[PDB]
Amino acid sequence: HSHGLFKKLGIPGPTPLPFLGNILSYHKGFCMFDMECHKKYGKVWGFYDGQQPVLAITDPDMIKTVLVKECYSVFTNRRPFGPVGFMKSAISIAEDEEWKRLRSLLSPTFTSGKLKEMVPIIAQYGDVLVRNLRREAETGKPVTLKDVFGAYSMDVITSTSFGVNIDSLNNPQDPFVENTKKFDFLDPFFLSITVFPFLIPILEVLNICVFPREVTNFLRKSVKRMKESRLEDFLQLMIDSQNHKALSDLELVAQSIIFIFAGYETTSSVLSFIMYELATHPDVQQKLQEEIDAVLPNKAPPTYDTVLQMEYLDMVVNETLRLFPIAMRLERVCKKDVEINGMFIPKGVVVMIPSYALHRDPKYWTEPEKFLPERFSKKNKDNIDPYIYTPFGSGPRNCIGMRFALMNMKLALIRVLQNFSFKPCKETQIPLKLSLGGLLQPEKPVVLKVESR
Amino acid sequence: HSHGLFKKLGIPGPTPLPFLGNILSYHKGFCMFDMECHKKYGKVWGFYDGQQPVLAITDPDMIKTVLVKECYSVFTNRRPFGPVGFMKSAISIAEDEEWKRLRSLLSPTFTSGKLKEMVPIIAQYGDVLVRNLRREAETGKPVTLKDVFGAYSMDVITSTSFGVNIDSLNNPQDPFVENTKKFDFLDPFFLSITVFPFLIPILEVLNICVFPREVTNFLRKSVKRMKESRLEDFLQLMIDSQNHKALSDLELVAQSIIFIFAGYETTSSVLSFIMYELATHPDVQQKLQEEIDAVLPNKAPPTYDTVLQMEYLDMVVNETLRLFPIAMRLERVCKKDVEINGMFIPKGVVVMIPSYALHRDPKYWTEPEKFLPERFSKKNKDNIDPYIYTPFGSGPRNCIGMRFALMNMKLALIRVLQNFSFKPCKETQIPLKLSLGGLLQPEKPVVLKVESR
Numbered sequence A, B: 001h002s003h004g005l006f007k008k009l010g011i012p013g014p015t016p017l018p019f020l021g022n023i024l025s026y027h028k029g030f031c032m033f034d035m036e037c038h039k040k041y042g043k044v045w046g047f048y049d050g051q052q053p054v055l056a057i058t059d060p061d062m063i064k065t066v067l068v069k070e071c072y073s074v075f076t077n078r079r080p081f082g083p084v085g086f087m088k089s090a091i092s093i094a095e096d097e098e099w100k101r102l103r104s105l106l107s108p109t110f111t112s113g114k115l116k117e118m119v120p121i122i123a124q125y126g127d128v129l130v131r132n133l134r135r136e137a138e139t140g141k142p143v144t145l146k147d148v149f150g151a152y153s154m155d156v157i158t159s160t161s162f163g164v165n166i167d168s169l170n171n172p173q174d175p176f177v178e179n180t181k182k183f184d185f186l187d188p189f190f191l192s193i194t195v196f197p198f199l200i201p202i203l204e205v206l207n208i209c210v211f212p213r214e215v216t217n218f219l220r221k222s223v224k225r226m227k228e229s230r231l232e233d234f235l236q237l238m239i240d241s242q243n244h245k246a247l248s249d250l251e252l253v254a255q256s257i258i259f260i261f262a263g264y265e266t267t268s269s270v271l272s273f274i275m276y277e278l279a280t281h282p283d284v285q286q287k288l289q290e291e292i293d294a295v296l297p298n299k300a301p302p303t304y305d306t307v308l309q310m311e312y313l314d315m316v317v318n319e320t321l322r323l324f325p326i327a328m329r330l331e332r333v334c335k336k337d338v339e340i341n342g343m344f345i346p347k348g349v350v351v352m353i354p355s356y357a358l359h360r361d362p363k364y365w366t367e368p369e370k371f372l373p374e375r376f377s378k379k380n381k382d383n384i385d386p387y388i389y390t391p392f393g394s395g396p397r398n399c400i401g402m403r404f405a406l407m408n409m410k411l412a413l414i415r416v417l418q419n420f421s422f423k424p425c426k427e428t429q430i431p432l433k434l435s436l437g438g439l440l441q442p443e444k445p446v447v448l449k450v451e452s453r
Ligand code: HEM
Pocket: A067, A091, A092, A093, A103, A258, A259, A262, A263, A264, A266, A267, A270, A321, A325, A326, A327, A330, A331, A390, A391, A392, A393, A394, A395, A396, A397, A398, A399, A400, A401, A402, A404, A405, A406
């Protein structure tokens, strides 16, 4: 069918198999496949997710044209994702004018002004974090980060989005925590999708959701109770906004679901990659406790302004995100016949930017596998192309939650490094192995020793 | 396609719509549709679940030929059910020689000899039931039966099948309880099945299970730990039996899953229908406490022999099961061109016995909507056709768990009625309304007052 498209256009790439395309090559994971394609083929190449053509690009100008210059015109949507059900209306999933509308209604939620109002609340849970860490540091029993971080990141969402305040590590079975804890793009299911994308319309008419039909109905009503218990946070910022069109009720639920997830799994996963790097680089960790103590003496509480003051803290976070950009790739569907930077791109091709591989290219990064926060010092931070280093994307469809994510993680680190130091255990996987699957997550979970200062 | 089959054969029935068949008629539920078809059409009739022909029969001789005489030859399997995944091997689902084999390997599990050994264990949880009922009887706050009964019935399964001992009402969040608590044949999904049965093979290759891919994998390993923590109950009776073919590992998991469910949802639901009837018939309830006190004076513990001694207890249970046969219908797929009792039945037709309607036919039951346990007294119990009253089916494929179910429920009742009496509350739905959906369960859950004797 559409297997001859790259041979024709003169773009190189691995030869596709009938039906499967190049997907057997995902057996080492997206990231390794991207690195190898990049090395073997240069600046542009092509491959087929089943029948779907995918054009990878690594030129910073071309990348900017896709993500910024020609976003509204050509490269507006992400790869069709399904089956979604009513989550078709979630901002990260929606398309064209429905997205533009949702991006407009939801943008003022993420300003610096509202972000500054959420700091005192994310603080109270920064303490709750300490108390549950102290119990396991005074009990010299190794600690699993995703649990305690996830409990924290869960605590921050529920509060920043609905007010619900829970000790999710100590109230792990409170129902509002159950639902909310519940996508491996290389598991039995989504591989079957790529080989049978004609099956998505089938699953839709069958009221099948990759977002289980149960969790969603919990929040559809949890919201429409809160909706009627508030006028009788994120949700509030959304109800107040339905006062360019009417932000409906079920749409409001779908945004909540996307925010809940992002602020939980992404935030907690990144915070775990950081503490790993800090533990396997003891000096970096010490240097940061020194900076935190210098800006916040006597273990003083971090404020909004003192967080943006801490520069090595910023350097550490950016560097972790270099080595582990949790999105792995950025993507846009080409909606017209177009030509950008001298190259013809036909309609329907997915254009892909392989962030993970670019973050680790030796043609922009010296010793790229090494954790070296100094790359981001205000001296060298100018020698870093913002279209090579893109942990939050770029352009009108970049990560809306970027400012909040950064602030959330950094307040976690500050209140935690004030009180504790983190040391590799015996059971600590060194060096960390990335999941061979479809997620930027560790092969084995991260386990470390903790000591009260 | 196959819509002309009953018009041809000369069998009456509602005219089918293209594609849908007669399924819009399920809008009052299977049970009402069966009663009306029975009244309007007589002893035999036909309808179409989509394209699938279904022949309903109500003649006791014909019924016995299907369920008993010609079971191995013609009417061996139940209606194909999907998508099932590895649960294809569960006994209630399997077919032909794979079923015969599993029915043979699993039958000795349910003898009177093993049943008598399980009594002391189902007893210890009969007490655990009392303590959690007393807390809500000394707190004059109405009680919801499915919860406390389900917690009990859950406690009996886990123990009778794997030894795991849990206070599931007080340990409601113990993980082994979580999984195990997790089919509406008229919900968005299964209606779509009947209209697109060609979609089941699609869902199978897509590793889609109506038994969620997660709960199953919990027990697949929970078993293969117990498998290796036992030689280093039901499960034991099965591992000991793999010592006519080798009972494999994944097959063992699939039987456990079917047993866990049946012993939980069926048992707890029936026990809730009984206490409703007892509360809305105060004399019946009193009479049974008198019989229990007479056989077990001083609130003496029930034994295996004293349970089979109690006859009004038997009368009460049978009568409840008359009014609420939780299976609603029995079914067999006709696998050959055949003729039974003067009627030609072609290959592939589902033959259906509408138990609910027959249990409520005024042509065998006087005042059938009334709860009258005397119908089952040893005087009148002979005027009751065992192919009209069939709460557990009949023949080689009848309910394997019948003896155990009866024993389990009755030990619950005895230890509970010894200590408490049950009274209708204000919020008590009288008369009980049956679910308009695809389950023999109450519209509103059953809530009753409880008083310590
Ligand atoms: C460390 C945490 C996070 C990282 C590294 C991250 C990264 C990203 C990336 C790479 C994208 C795609 C951008 C593009 O295609 O140009 C994205 C999109 C998005 N992110 Fe995040 N993200 C994070 C956390 C969050 C959080 C906490 C939220 C909370 C609201 C959030 C909400 C979104 C949304 C809604 C989108 C889609 C935006 C749109 O399509 O208009 N993200 N993120």
